[PDB]
Design a protein around this nucleic acid. Structure first.
Lengths: 141, 722, 493, 548
RNA sequence: UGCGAAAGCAGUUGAAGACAAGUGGCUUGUCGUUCGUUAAAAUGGCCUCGUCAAACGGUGGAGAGAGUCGCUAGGUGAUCGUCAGAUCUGCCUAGUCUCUAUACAGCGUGUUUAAUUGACAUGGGUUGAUGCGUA
């Protein structure tokens, strides 16, 4: 090609990222589903993770997360964050799970030393969901 | 390269600190002194000196120069034919010039050229001369309107004239002024036809014997340049689209050449058979300077044989009687048919009266191969200064920069501005930051995008590859005031530190595992005040970072990335409130650091934790630079000192359009002014190349530097076989 | 002059859980085959040499499948009890099978009728039989006699070495892949013993205490070996007798392992692991045995294998389940007068001094929207956006190119009811996504700015505007509640 | 150039050992050791020893005795080894070697015949160097470096008995000519205030620096370029800096002349014969952040005033960019004399202090930028008005409008005039957030709440607000929520800050439901006026009329 | 236009002269005219140099598509009916379940961290659109 011809712009396979991925630093309760959820999260079992969080009764979700062990509430929250990042219609039903994980395990993940670095994907997903709120405010006006 | 300032032979013609209207106006190939014997050129300047210069071998140390007996006239051009020589001159009502043609002779006393005065034209609007130089056309403004007159100059073969209302259509008199304004004209080597290019976009070939016209409509914006071929059967035209068209005048058939990195402000055929086209490309994405690229190209395959260009910086403001060229609408890249006079009056008044006379730019030096990278608008000119020719040119944003010649409305769109770029200290990566602007008259027209890109090349290839880009670093709509590359001790010189106008900092670094440049460290404060008077510095050890926000120089560490702390409280002063917002925090070496703010210039030691020296800046740099540009005005070294740099706009007996530069150096914490230099022109950027020199960029872009039997048979055979 | 820059497809910031190269490569193992066996598939080995056939040990038969048709080419049915192990020799020439009566029988492969020799091992069931990987004429059989035996296949009457020392149910052998004197055996008491065969052989030189009862031990390097048993697997440096990784990413006991090297893959090495709960997972030995991909199967997976390192054809991952069936997932791969007249067209300049090359490379074909943006047909480019078969990022990038480049209004000028309904009917779908909704916002804003009278006239885009209103109402409830979650974990810093 | 300053034989062991340091003793018999226990046998003792070392075995120990030779000891077992005498003059500083590293038969008198670490192994006779008063052993390529008071430097390598280099080093009577921490140099201290580093590979000075103050017992630490130095008649062992992977914190070197300062670790209490107390417990020299602490060996501050770029024909200054003036006539003598003109009998009046300050600095009396000022000068005039004299109307208005006020601002709540207090809220450019939060939560229910919330938001980071607004009671925050609910943008985000910083659980319910209802209606009105801000043909038959 | 932060905060928009049109003046409008102020449109758009097919290597994906009326949560309709509720085995959406050449998109394989080969005489002539129906 010519020597005076400028180089065109080409991204190629450059990784486009945002500025918000901080990935670097007797019974009497119900019949819940938390053994299913716990041995979904001990492995990486997307299939039975989907069969445990297609349950959407609020008291079942509530005491399920209450009976959950708090050392893996952070990875339940990571799985929920990645699923609502990918599928956008899940944000309605699945963020009921993410608000209950914060309310119940409000001590474990305030005692964790790097909250944003450990659940970066939630922060990036909610930042990109709520960043454009003035724009669709102007749109619906 | 015949350097003018190399010798007093013709630097005595011009070395002035105030007067650069002495200009070089024509070059001829022969020798006007003695005929019939050529390997040397005779240059006519715009005042009346005629220098004869040998460009084969070493330049002679006494050229054959003369000075023609001239009136107040100022030398439009000279003309050559067989044997004879003409010259044309300009004059002193409505502001129009006035032209006057002489003929030359030389022979009797070999110091003076005698002149003859053929004729005059008492008001000239526009002019052109044919390719052979045998005839010339021009415009008149003689009443209801203008007029058009063609005249052969080396003979009275033909001289005709007519009002151009007989050229113009009947539709144009009830249409806009662009339809009757004419921005170009050309004649062929016979004077049979003439091309009138109008500001509306059309061209019209009139046939001069009978004044019948033919319209050629392709240019959707103003026609800026026209030329004929030698036989007159092809018309080259160029305009605001960056497309050179050539019209086959038999069938009216265009051949195009579409993406010519600048608008064609002049085009002409060049060879005896017409095998070259020479073009001038105005490159009008920056409105702050008129930077022309000279490009001839062979006519066979239309490839750019020998494109020529100077360095292309973009200054923060317009420079010196710079007028962006004519067009159809008044845009942010051009001006309409009305506003050229008002714009030049306003620009002269702005250079006289106003206060923010800062037109300073950022230039970078690639620390591997010592070539300097002028970031143009949405592009970079990589340019090496040991031969002062451009390495290449590369588009670094995603605009409509290259894909399209923008026209009358579309010139109100701007491609994203590259405002920062810095190399990592081993020269392996190039960090760049750009502001992507939205088009007007829609919902998202008032939120910018801020994009930080990371480029890589090996040491052979001339162009960089984007490895990653982060859109909105630091958050949405927030700028990056300063990026700083990191020293060789953090991630093997593969980290960058970006600063907000919130005082937030982000440390980005390239790790090989996830093979990308990712976000490592973060310190965000959430204030409610913003200021772009942000500066940054790093310790060479890689231990502590000096975050010079406005009025406040915080001291952060690197391990926990918060403000510095020792529990023993050994007068751990980790903030230095100064009298004004600080714009340079340049640390010369690990002992001390020079702060520069808009009143004073302090220096602070850290092995003796207090102020050591101070200087007064307010009488020199008061409210004249934008806050954040003292960092490009002053610089440092790694051993041998620090360089301040001030500017005095000169005065009459009010300020003027003339400038002088006062650069000063200091060694070893502001001790001695061991360099006090004065340069004849405004100075725009100074920076230390990595081998103990400091390069600076003049406002007219001269880069300067502050440093430390058989013999006769052989001769006759090389004659007779060449 | 330059060439024209291509229209860059709008890529957003990347979302979490992107497709890694490892999982793209391991996800193109597809077209699953399910073959119902008579009983649980206990072992599966591959032919080493022409690595293109594999033997599946069901109950009382061993079937060699081909790696190009996936049907049983050959079968071995003349066992008296349940056949347990079946492996090929390192030359791929003959096939050993340990049987529940403690009768190792070695046939030659690809000939089920010629049983070459029947070693009568222990009276207990012989559960693992494999030849040496360096040597050719020695066969190691461990049984439910808590003693493995090395047999020279010439002298098949007494075992040439008797490796005892383990307290319970030796179920696995392994050989160390550079030192041929080194046999690592693994039993149901934990305790990977390993033996130097030049010594006595009744005592291991050392022992590696996997705490769970091991199910398999394989050798990865000449130095490090991996033992699976219980819910984890551990890796052991063998020159330093010392554990250095352990991955417990399963629910139930890891039944088997195998390992791949140097094959055509982004992963330079791969250890896959099969674990009685349905899962088979692949772990990359170069970044600290991190898991990269996995398959879930319809029952507890008892054994697994992949095609060997030099497969050169159709490549296989096979997993045999305890349910009694076998799952294969593969990745696949004019006249002499006229020629004498047109001879030279394949010469390419070998003996020739100067060789000129200015044939330009043929680039990718331009799509219709890209050539219409090139031809400045901006309304036709919008029309070419809203065809049905267009990718969502392609509609987004032509909207963004018309937004940045020229004029939304130019692209929308000559429209009416019938020619706006594609745009708004796509804007319904694009208002949900984050990456599109800014562009959808300003395009809808411009079209209602300059078509507010067609709003009055046509009722059949009024309803489209109402549906768009309820869409932005749902999206603004979502963008408000996301800010509420953002605050409610900003509280927890 | 100091370090963290406090604390007013095998050379690589520590504690948990028995005695890896057996050393000689002043005014005693020969030698001793102690524990935190190994036996103290004899290495053919009772001579004129001045130091004692071992062969890095502690049962092949010795007593380095001034008798031209030395023998071995048995400090653990009981079995001695044989020896062989070389000289008979003074071997008081004998240092037995490792397995063939650095050994020669140099006793005291220029007889450095090379040998090995054995009782009968020999080498060449490398006694060529002159009478050296400072012979040390380093590990460049294990080498005897001789510095001679015949003055000349030489360096022989006891690896092949090869004289590597040598020159004329004019070294006088030294204090400690100790080899460097990386061994590449020689740190030789001059007597009172100086320590020069010389190049110990070529025998030439590389950096001759002065020191801070009096120091006598100086030796290079196990650092990069740092030394320790104890005072002569002082127990003060300070550190200075002119091993790089995971450096030392204690047990670095034992050469000191304090009050029996043997076996000097960081916690240097349990000595080998002394049984003393301990001191500092820091590590060696770090890269560059500890030199902001140890900012010593320079204490020469003067009164730095703003200079000017020197007037070399300054009359051609070419259109100065000021308003009307060109240069302020600097009077630092009048700046100092204004202190005497102010510290007078204007004990309640603004006739001899405020007029004095506004005459010395001719400004608009509320504005900066006609500066020529020093922070010590402003601090001393602020002290002279904080003495016998806030009733001045010009001085203490124009100098909280100065960015150098230096922390005399704490009584700004403790004095309460309205206009001076609001001006010190808005403009005083260094304020303590403790007093700012106290003024914020000591509410007088006015617009100064907005003026104090403004500054507390616009000059402090949010987490530094949160950590120091944890330091509040609960009645303050309950009345703050009550006053916000009663009766704006910066106080909304301040309310966000108080909700983030009160904590998680320990709240009440009625205040929470009241705040919930209030902010529900607040979001509703914010939504509606955001909506307001974002909200800012022919028929076939007609019938009409025309003129008749 | 100035100060600014990317928000915003203060300032506006005169005079002369000439010319054109309309009805020597009067009105209106222009200016390749000057002084002062910090101050939309002339049917008129971008070149050839070789395409097609099949791979391969990284990069993104809202995945490209097809089912099961299988589950979870919903939004809603026709007719009758006092409602209760009936039939339409009511419809639509999202998620889940199942499957495919990851079907989708993009950059590259001339040297690159990586990764490419093959077809074709890259012409001329005659019909080819009034010859066509599966709608």
């Amino acid at each position: 090609k010519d020597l005076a011809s400028a180089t065109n712009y080409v991204e190629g396979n450059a990784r486009v990222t945002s500025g918000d991925n901080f990935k670097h630093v007797t019974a009497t309760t119900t019949g819940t589903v938390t053994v299913i959820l716990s041995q979904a999260l001990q492995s990486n079992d997307h299939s039975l993770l989907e069969t445990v969080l297609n349950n959407r009764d609020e008291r079942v979700i509530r005491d399920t997360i209450f009976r959950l062990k708090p050392a893996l509430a952070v990875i339940l929250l990571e799985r929920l964050a990645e699923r609502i990042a990918r599928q956008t219609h899940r944000q309605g039903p699945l963020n009921v799970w993410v608000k209950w994980c914060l309310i119940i395990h409000g001590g474990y993940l305030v005692s964790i030393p790097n909250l944003m670095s450990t659940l970066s994907s939630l922060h990036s997903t909610l930042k990109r969901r709520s960043d454009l709120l003035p724009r669709l405010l102007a749109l619906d006006a | 390269t015949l350097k003018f300032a190399n010798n007093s032979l013709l630097s005595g013609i011009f070395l002035q600190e105030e007067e650069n209207n002495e200009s070089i106006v024509k070059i001829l190939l022969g020798d006007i002194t003695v005929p019939q014997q050529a390997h040397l050129i005779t240059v006519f300047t715009n005042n009346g000196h005629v220098i004869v210069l040998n460009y084969k071998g070493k330049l002679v140390e006494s050229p054959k120069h003369f000075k023609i007996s001239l009136a107040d006239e100022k030398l439009a051009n000279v003309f050559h034919s067989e044997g004879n020589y003409r010259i044309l001159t300009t004059f002193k009502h409505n502001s129009l010039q006035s032209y006057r043609l002489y003929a030359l002779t030389f022979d009797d006393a070999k110091k003076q050229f005698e002149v003859a005065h053929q004729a005059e034209w008492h008001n000239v609007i526009l002019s052109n001369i044919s390719s052979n130089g045998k005839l010339l056309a021009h415009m008149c403004k003689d009443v209801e309107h203008k007029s058009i007159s063609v005249v052969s100059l080396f003979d009275d073969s033909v001289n005709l004239s007519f009002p151009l209302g007989s050229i113009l259509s009947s539709q144009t008199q009830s249409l806009s002024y662009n339809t009757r304004y004419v921005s170009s004209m050309a004649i062929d080597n016979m004077g049979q036809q003439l091309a009138v290019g109008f500001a509306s976009g059309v061209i019209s070939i009139v046939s001069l014997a009978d004044l019948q016209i033919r319209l050629l409509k392709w240019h959707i914006d103003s026609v800026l340049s026209l030329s004929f071929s030698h036989d007159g059967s092809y018309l080259l035209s160029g305009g605001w689209e960056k497309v050179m068209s050539l019209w086959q005048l038999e069938t009216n058939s265009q051949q195009f050449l579409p993406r010519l990195n600048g608008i064609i402000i002049d085009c002409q055929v060049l060879g005896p058979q017409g095998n070259y086209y020479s073009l001038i490309l105005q490159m009008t994405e920056n409105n702050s300077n008129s930077d022309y690229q000279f490009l001839l190209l062979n006519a066979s395959d239309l490839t750019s044989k020998l494109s020529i260009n100077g360095p292309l910086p973009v200054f923060n403001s317009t420079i010196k009687h710079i007028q962006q060229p004519i067009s159809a609408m008044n845009t942010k890249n051009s001006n309409s048919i009305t506003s050229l006079n008002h714009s030049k009056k306003k620009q002269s008044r702005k250079l006289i009266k106003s206060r923010r006379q800062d037109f300073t730019t950022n230039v970078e030096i690639n620390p591997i191969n010592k070539n300097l990278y002028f970031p143009h608008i949405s592009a970079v000119q990589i340019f090496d200064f040991y031969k002062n020719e451009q390495v290449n040119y590369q588009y670094l944003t995603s605009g409509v920069n290259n894909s399209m010649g923008k026209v009358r409305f579309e010139l109100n769109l701007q491609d994203p501005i590259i405002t920062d770029l810095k190399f990592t200290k081993d020269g392996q990566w190039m960090i760049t930051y750009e502001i992507e602007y939205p088009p007007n008259d829609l919902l998202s027209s008032k939120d910018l995008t801020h994009i930080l890109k990371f480029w890589t090349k090996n040491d052979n290839e001339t162009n960089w590859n984007l490895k990653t880009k982060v859109i909105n670093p630091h958050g949405i709509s927030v700028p990056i005031t300063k990026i700083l590359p990191s020293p060789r001790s953090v991630n093997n010189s593969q980290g960058c530190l970006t600063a907000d106008n919130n005082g937030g900092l982000k440390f980005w670094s390239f790790d090989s595992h996830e093979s990308n440049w990712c976000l490592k460290k973060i310190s965000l404060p959430n204030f409610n005040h913003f200021s772009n008077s942000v500066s940054l510095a790093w310790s060479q050890d890689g231990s502590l970072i000096f975050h010079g926000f406005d009025d406040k120089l915080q001291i952060l560490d690197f391990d926990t990335f918060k403000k510095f702390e020792s529990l023993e409280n050994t007068k751990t002063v980790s903030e230095f409130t100064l009298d004004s917002e600080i714009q340079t925090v340049k640390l010369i070496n690990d002992t001390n650091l020079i702060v520069a703010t808009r009143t004073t210039l302090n220096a602070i030691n850290l092995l003796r934790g207090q102020v050591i020296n101070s200087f007064d800046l307010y009488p020199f740099v008061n409210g004249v630079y934008k806050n954040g540009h003292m960092d490009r005005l002053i610089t440092c070294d790694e051993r041998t000192g620090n360089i301040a740099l001030v500017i005095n706009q000169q005065l009459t007996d009010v300020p003027t359009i003339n400038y002088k530069s006062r650069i000063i150096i200091f060694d070893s914490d502001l001790s001695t002014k061991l360099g006090n230099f004065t340069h004849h022109e405004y100075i725009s950027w100074i920076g230390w190349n990595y081998d103990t020199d400091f390069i600076f960029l003049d406002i007219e872009s001269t880069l300067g530097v502050v440093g430390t039997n058989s013999d006769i048979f052989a001769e006759q055979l090389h004659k007779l076989s060449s | 002059s330059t060439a024209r820059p291509r229209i860059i497809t709008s890529k957003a910031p990347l979302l979490p859980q992107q497709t890694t190269p490892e999982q793209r490569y391991w996800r193109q193992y597809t077209s699953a085959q399910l073959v119902k066996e008579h009983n649980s598939v206990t072992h599966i080995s591959f032919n080493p040499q022409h690595p293109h056939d594999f033997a599946v040990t069901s109950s009382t038969r061993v079937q060699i499948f081909s790696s190009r048709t996936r049907q049983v080419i050959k079968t071995f049915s003349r066992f008296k009890d349940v056949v347990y192990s079946a492996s090929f020799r390192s030359d791929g020439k003959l096939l050993c099978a340990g049987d529940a009566t403690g009768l190792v029988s070695v046939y030659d492969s690809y000939n089920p009728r010629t049983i070459l020799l029947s070693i009568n091992a222990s009276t207990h069931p012989t559960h693992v039989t494999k030849f040496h990987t360096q040597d050719n004429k020695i066969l190691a059989t461990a049984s439910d006699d808590r003693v493995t035996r090395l047999w020279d296949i010439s002298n098949a009457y007494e075992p040439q070495l008797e490796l005892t020392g383990a307290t319970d149910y030796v179920r696995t052998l392994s050989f160390i892949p550079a030192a041929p004197h080194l046999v690592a055996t693994g039993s149901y008491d934990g305790l990977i013993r390993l033996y130097d065969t030049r010594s006595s052989g009744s005592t291991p030189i050392y022992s590696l205490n996997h705490d769970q009862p091991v199910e398999n031990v394989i050798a990865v390097s000449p130095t490090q070996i991996v033992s699976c048993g219980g819910n984890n697997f551990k890796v052991w440096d063998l020159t330093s007798n010392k554990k250095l990784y352990e991955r417990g990413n399963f629910n139930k006991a890891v039944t088997c392992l195998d390992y791949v090297e140097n094959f055509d893959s982004p992963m330079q090495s791969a250890l896959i692991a099969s674990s009685l709960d349905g899962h088979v997972k692949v772990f990359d030995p170069l970044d600290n045995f991190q898991v990269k991909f996995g398959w879930k199967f319809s029952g507890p997976v008892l054994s697994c294998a992949v095609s060997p390192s030099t497969a050169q054809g159709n490549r296989h991952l096979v997993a045999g389940l305890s349910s009694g069936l076998l799952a294969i997932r593969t990745k696949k791969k004019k006249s002499n007068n006229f020629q004498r007249m047109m001879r030279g067209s394949e010469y390419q300049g070998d003996q020739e001094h100067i060789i000129h090359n200015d044939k330009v490379r043929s680039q990718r074909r331009m799509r219709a929207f890209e050539r219409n943006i090139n031809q400045f047909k901006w309304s036709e480019a919008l029309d070419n956006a809203f065809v049905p078969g267009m990718a969502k990022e392609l509609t987004l990038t032509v909207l963004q190119e018309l937004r940045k480049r020229g004029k939304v209004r130019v692209a929308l000028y000559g429209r009416d009811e019938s020619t706006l309904e594609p745009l708004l009917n796509w804007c319904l779908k694009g208002i949900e996504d984050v990456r599109s909704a800014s562009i959808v916002a300003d395009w809808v804003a411009v079209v209602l700015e300059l078509y507010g009278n067609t709003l009055e006239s046509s009722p059949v885009l009024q309803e489209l505007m109402i549906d768009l209103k309820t869409k932005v109402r749902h999206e603004i409830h979502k963008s408000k509640e996301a800010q509420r979650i953002e605050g409610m974990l900003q509280l927890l810093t | 150039d100091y370090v963290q300053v406090a604390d007013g034989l095998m050379v690589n062991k520590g504690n948990y050992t028995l005695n890896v340091i057996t050393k000689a003793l002043e005014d005693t018999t020969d030698t001793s050791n102690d524990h935190l226990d190994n036996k103290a046998y004899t290495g053919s003792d009772e001579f004129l020893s001045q130091y004692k070392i071992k062969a890095k075995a502690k049962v092949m120990s010795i007593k380095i005795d001034t008798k031209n030779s030395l023998v071995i000891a048995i400090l653990q077992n009981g079995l001695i080894e044989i020896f062989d005498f070389k000289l008979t003059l003074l071997h008081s500083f004998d240092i037995s070697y490792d397995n063939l590293k650095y050994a020669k038969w140099f006793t005291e008198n220029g007889t450095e015949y090379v040998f090995v670490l054995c009782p009968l192994q020999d080498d060449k006779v490398c006694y060529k160097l002159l009478e050296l008063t400072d012979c040390g052993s380093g590990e460049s390529s294990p080498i005897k470096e001789l510095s001679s008071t015949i003055i000349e430097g030489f360096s022989f390598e006891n690896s092949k008995l090869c004289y590597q280099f040598g020159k004329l080093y004019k070294l006088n009577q030294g204090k400690i000519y100790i080899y460097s921490l990386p061994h590449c140099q020689l740190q030789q201290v001059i007597e009172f205030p100086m320590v020069d580093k010389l190049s110990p590979g070529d025998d030439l000075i590389s950096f001759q620096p002065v020191s801070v103050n009096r120091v006598l017992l100086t030796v290079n630490n196990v650092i990069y370029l740092l030394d320790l130095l104890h005072c002569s008649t002082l127990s003060q062992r300070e550190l200075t800096h002119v091993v790089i992977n995971s450096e030392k914190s204690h047990n670095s070197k034992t050469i000191a002349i304090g009050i029996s300062t043997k076996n000097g670790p960081n916690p240097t209490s349990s000595l080998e014969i002394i049984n003393i107390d301990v001191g500092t417990n820091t590590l060696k020299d770090s890269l560059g952040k500890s030199f902001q602490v140890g900012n010593n060996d320079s204490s020469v501050i003067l009164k730095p005033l703003f200079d000017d770029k020197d007037i070399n024909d300054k009359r051609v200054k070419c259109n100065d960019v000021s308003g009307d003036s060109s240069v302020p006539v600097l009077h630092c003598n009048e700046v100092i004399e204004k202190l005497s003109a102010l510290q007078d009998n204007d004990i309640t009046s603004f006739d001899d202090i405020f007029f004095k300050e506004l005459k010395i600095k001719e400004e608009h009396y509320t504005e900066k930028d006609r500066y020529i000022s020093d922070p010590g000068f402003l601090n001393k005039v602020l002290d002279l008005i904080f003495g016998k004299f806030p009733k001045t109307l010009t001085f203490l208005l124009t100098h909280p409008l100065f960015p150098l006020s230096r922390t005399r601002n704490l009584l700004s709540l403790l004095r309460d005039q309205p206009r001076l207090f609001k001006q010190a809220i808005v403009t005083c450019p260094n304020l303590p957030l403790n007093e700012l939060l106290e003024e914020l939560f000591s509410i007088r229910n006015r617009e100064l709440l907005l003026d104090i919330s403004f500054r507390i938001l616009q000059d402090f980071t949010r987490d530094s607000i949160k950590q120091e607004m944890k330091k509040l009671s609960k009645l303050d925050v309950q009345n703050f929520i009550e006053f916000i609910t009663s009766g704006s943008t910066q106080l909304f985000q301040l309310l966000s800050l108080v909700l983030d910083s009160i904590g998680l659980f320990s709240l009440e319910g009625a205040l929470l439901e009241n705040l919930t209802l209030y902010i529900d209606k607040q979001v509703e009105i914010a939504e509606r006026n955001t909506e307001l801000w974002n909200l800012i043909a022919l028929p076939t038959y007609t019938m009409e009329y025309l003129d008749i």
